[PDB]
Design a protein around this ligand. Structure first.
Ligand code: ZN
Ligand code: ZN
Lengths: 30, 21, 30, 30, 21, 30, 21, 30, 21, 21, 30, 21
């Protein structure tokens, strides 16, 4: 199987799904 | 960064774990 | 990964991200 | 009136809206 | 399939009902 | 179609999909 | 109104269509 | 800082966030 | 309209307040 | 089933993967 | 702007829209 | 913290802005 592009708010939604309680940082300028 | 890896290119849910705290 | 609490459309979003091009079936109890 | 494109997670959200309790299948390879 | 009908082309909410169980 | 239980932003998403290019008004009680 | 009925109870897509322009 | 594009359902989600209880109109033909 | 201002071009959350009731 | 377990309790992404085609 | 009641992924969506290209940190209590 | 306050109570966009980088 191959993956797809995750952009904008969909990217942060995916980070929420994967990290949950751990929290995460979203730093697009990095 | 994350936008280059996951939006411009493609990434897996495993690679997203790199940005958890 | 972490455990998830997922209701309503949030569950289908999670299935979409987990399954990708494989697709999925959504089968609620009735 | 004319319709719009429904792609990615927005497509599955729309299937959830339309099918609800009936369930649905999302099979993009088909 | 559904991606060709609704994403690449356009479809109505009525056509989406085709993919309900 | 099926009946819906829709709160918060989920209701505006549903209005967006139902109304399309017609647009809509969102008028909560205050 | 509709915003409240959909959330406290249930509503149909046909009832929502009344809020389209 | 510079802003981004808000399209489709993401636009209405943003209107919900900004207007909330005040309500809003989404009239794309205007 | 709103699509030209916020989707085709870019707009701020302050400009979105123009479309509140 | 899974739809109910995820909402009334909790579920893991590995449990969700069983619903992939 | 109005006050917000935001749970789950809705909070991360709001952070995404407020912060834009600045990015954000999501730090739930554990 | 903010995640909890927004969900159990209410919060403003100005309070959220403090979590921007
Ligand atoms: Zn989108
Ligand atoms: Zn929700």
């Amino acid at each position: 199987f191959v993956n797809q592009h995750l952009c904008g708010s969909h990217l942060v939604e995916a980070l929420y799904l994967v990290c949950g309680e751990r929290g995460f940082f979203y730093t697009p300028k990095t | 960064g994350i936008v280059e890896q996951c939006c411009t290119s493609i990434c897996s849910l495993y690679q997203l774990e790199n940005y958890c705290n």
